[PDB]
Amino acid sequence: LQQICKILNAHMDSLQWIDQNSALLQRKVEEV
Amino acid sequence: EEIYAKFVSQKISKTRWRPLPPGSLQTAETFATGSWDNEENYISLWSIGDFGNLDSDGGFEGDHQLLCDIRHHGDVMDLQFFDQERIVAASSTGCVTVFLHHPNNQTLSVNQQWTTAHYHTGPGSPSYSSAPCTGVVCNNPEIVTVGEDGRINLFRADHKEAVRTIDNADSSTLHAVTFLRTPEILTVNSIGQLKIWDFRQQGNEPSQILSLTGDRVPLHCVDRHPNQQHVVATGGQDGMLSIWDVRQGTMPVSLLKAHEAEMWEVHFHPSNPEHLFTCSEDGSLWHWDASISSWLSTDPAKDRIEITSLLPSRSLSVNTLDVLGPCLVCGTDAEAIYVTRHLFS
Amino acid sequence: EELDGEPTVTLIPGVNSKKNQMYFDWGPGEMLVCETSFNKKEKSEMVPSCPFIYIIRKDVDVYSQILRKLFNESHGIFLGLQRIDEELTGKSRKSQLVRVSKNYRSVIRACMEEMHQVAIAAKDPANGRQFSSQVSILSAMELIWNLCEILFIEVAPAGPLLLHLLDWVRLHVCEVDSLSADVLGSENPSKHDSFWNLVTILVLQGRLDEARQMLSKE
Amino acid sequence: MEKVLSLPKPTIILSAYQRKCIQSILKEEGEHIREMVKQINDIRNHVNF
Amino acid sequence: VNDVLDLEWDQHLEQKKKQRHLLVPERETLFNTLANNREIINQQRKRLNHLVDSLQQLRLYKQTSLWSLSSAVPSQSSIHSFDSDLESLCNALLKTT
């Protein structure tokens, strides 16, 4: 279960990184 | 709603609800059954399974749980609660047994037994033969029973002997019995008669007789309206339902076709008694609603009785029913029991 | 031809067949047997044996106390079968007869694993072996019925027939999921000695994304 | 808190099929996340400003 | 530090309350978090596809072709779901026809 939690956390980091880049590209498409 | 059937691997001759505490708000939580025709017959206490939950691990806990049992001797011909811990049963051995439940242990035990309540006699010696005890009715401290011997007994739940016996109250079988008024009972027989008996009278003769007109239809079952001590319902060998006012002549007031076979029990609803229920050897179970009381109309094509088959197909025989509040139970020769918690939904 | 083995041999306790003759009669489910010996004491101090009567009930196994469930629950399904209309079309009736088949299988299963718990609860290993033997008979019945259902009642066509036959094996060859629990419960599943046996057996059952998940622990 | 530690807790044994379920789902969702990262980097490589 | 220590102690008082009326929350936090993660995955995926649609409308991105994945689920073991799998297979076969 501690291994499952480590995987879930590593997915939440990667999804926060996805949100911050999906938003950055969205501003860069609203800019142009 | 749906009716929850359970197989039990014994034929059920009788079922009864456990009487609720005076002024409780509970539904009927517990019932008792008796069995017949096995290599071993029993009396068993059951709790209705709780169809409202799932726990985390996904099991169906909604089954009717067996609380406890006890082995019987003969067949359970008739069954009644005497209070909240004691049960009385008849037997095809002619025996009558009082049992006791032990809630702290979940067991049954014998409490008292009359091993020779019903018996056939022969010429000149006390070599008695077994006579099936057919019906039992209780009026605490008091108990009455009938049988193939045509005997009526009056027993008590503090006394070991009979308080009174009436031998040869009929030359045929007596089937069932009910209390009109406390010293005053009514019985039914193989001839198609209702016989009324007063335990105050010092002869053995019936206080009054009622019958059908001429044709012999055996009357297997009887009940007497909860608010009207003069209104009686009986069931025939043909599948007819007969309503009587025992004060008004010799005949039924209302005669209704209820079945295509022998009608094994009839009951008025214990709180809603303009409702009635019946079971039979045609494999059907019926509810009747009729809301002078509607049961005493001579024209059932004017005053409405609406009539509902509760079972979704004809089983093997439905020997018995009982109804308490919104709950109903019945028992069958398909080695199975049927229960609802809701009859008005 | 049929019945070309030895005729089924019941052993009767005490009875001394080794020279003693017998008399018998037929009741509705029980046959009586009695033996022609009576022991008129040649001077020995021992109790003389009376003759004995034996009540010999039919082998049709109706008297295993669990199987009363099987007979009543299947009679309810048999009256659920003789009440099927013949004009019910070859899709409605076929689906309903596939339900009747699966109802009967459910009763075999619900008698078998009740009897499996009774075999585990058997406080003498002789009684536990008697229940375990009748569990193996109910398993053979549900194995044959699961095949006869696929071939004759559902009548599986080419293609689906292989899917039907894969879970046919799986619902009886339950060895694999038991082995899966022990291998997966270990501190290092890819280092339980049976791990590679289980990886192969999951491929022999066609359970390929389950075999892929075991291979992921390597 | 310390005075409460002296009766056992029941070990929550996830079945060897329910452990497989969660591992399979964490694989499906882990691979979908890789595809979204790949797709965002490929657009970032194609839309240079 | 005092507000975290009051929060941990309100949660200790709540766990010690919860204990006095029976079993099973710990199964559901795991699955309700997996349900949320998979929804966040579907949300970002839909947002990224709308960004690709916008870049294709603007002629700033031209594309070839890509694909995407599918799920699976395992079974119960302990003895009472046969008719549910057989009804799931019979409804499957009826929808093949």
The DSSP line for B191-232 is: TSEEEEEETTSSSSS-SEEEE-SSS---EEEEEE-TT-TTEE
Local structure of E57: helix, strand or coil: helix
Long-range contacts of C146-150 (CB under 8 A, 24+ apart): C146/C105, C146/C171, C146/C172, C149/C98, C149/C101, C149/C102, C149/C105
Cα gap C108→C135, rounded to integer Å: 10
Cα gap B146→C22, rounded to integer Å: 47
Tell me the sheet residues that pair with B135: B146
Find tokens 């609802």 and name the residue: B340
Tell me the sheet residues that pair with B136: B145
- Please give the full DSSP string across B61-74, using - where no structure is assigned: --S-EEEEEEE-SS
Determine the angle formed by the axes of helices C195-204 and C208-217, rounding to 10 degrees. Answer: 160
Cα gap E20→E25, rounded to integer Å: 13
Cα gap C94→C87, rounded to integer Å: 11
First to last CA, chain C: 56
Find tokens 């009679």 and name the residue: C75
Structure token pair of residue C19: 């020279």
Of B324, B322, B331, the C-alpha closest to B28 is B324
Neighbours of C152 (CB within 10 A): 10
Local structure of C3: helix, strand or coil: coil
Cα gap B299→B290, rounded to integer Å: 13
Q: The dihedral of CA C148, C152, C155, C156: what is its sign?
A: positive
Interface of C to E at Cβ within 8 Å reads 95, 98, 102, 105-106, 109, 113, 154, 160, 167, 171, 177, 181, 209-210
Structure token pair of residue C200: 């192969």
- The experimental technique used to determine this model is cryo-EM
**Does residue E68 belong to the interface with chain D, where contact is any CB pair within 8 Å?**
yes
What are the CA-CA distances from residue B126 to residues B63, B73, B152, B165, B171 (Å)? 49, 22, 19, 17, 20
Resolution (A): 12.0
Single-letter code of the amino acid located at E65: S
For residue E61, the chain A residue with the least C-alpha distance is A29
Neighbours of E8 (CB within 10 A): 11
Determine whether the interchain pair C102/E82 forms a contact, defined as Cβ–Cβ distance below 8 Å.
yes
Tell me the sheet residues that pair with B234: B222, B242
- Chain D residues with beta carbon closer than 8 angstroms to that of A19: none
**Does residue E78 belong to the interface with chain C, where contact is any CB pair within 8 Å?**
no
- Chain A residues with beta carbon closer than 8 angstroms to that of D12: 1
What are the CA-CA distances from residue C28 to residues B61, C31, C54, C55, C56 (Å)? 40, 8, 15, 12, 11
Cα gap B172→B254, rounded to integer Å: 26
The alpha carbon of B125 is separated from its chain's Cα centroid by a whole number of angstroms, namely 35
Our answer on whether D and E touch (3+ beta-carbon pairs < 8 Å) is yes
Single-letter code of the amino acid located at E13: L
φ, ψ at B266 (rounded to 5°) = -135, 135
Cα gap B89→B35, rounded to integer Å: 11
Tell me the sheet residues that pair with E78: none
CB B96 within 8 A of CB B155: yes
What is the maximum alpha-carbon separation in chain B? 71
Structure token pair of residue C128: 């536990």
The alpha carbon of B110 is separated from its chain's Cα centroid by a whole number of angstroms, namely 21
Cα gap B294→B268, rounded to integer Å: 13
**Does residue E76 belong to the interface with chain B, where contact is any CB pair within 8 Å?**
yes
Find tokens 């093997």 and name the residue: B316
Cα gap B298→B9, rounded to integer Å: 44
Neighbours of C137 (CB within 10 A): 14
- Select from E72, E77, E96 the Cβ nearest to the Cβ of C177: E77
Cα gap A8→D30, rounded to integer Å: 9
151-180 of C, contacting B, C-beta below 8 A:
none
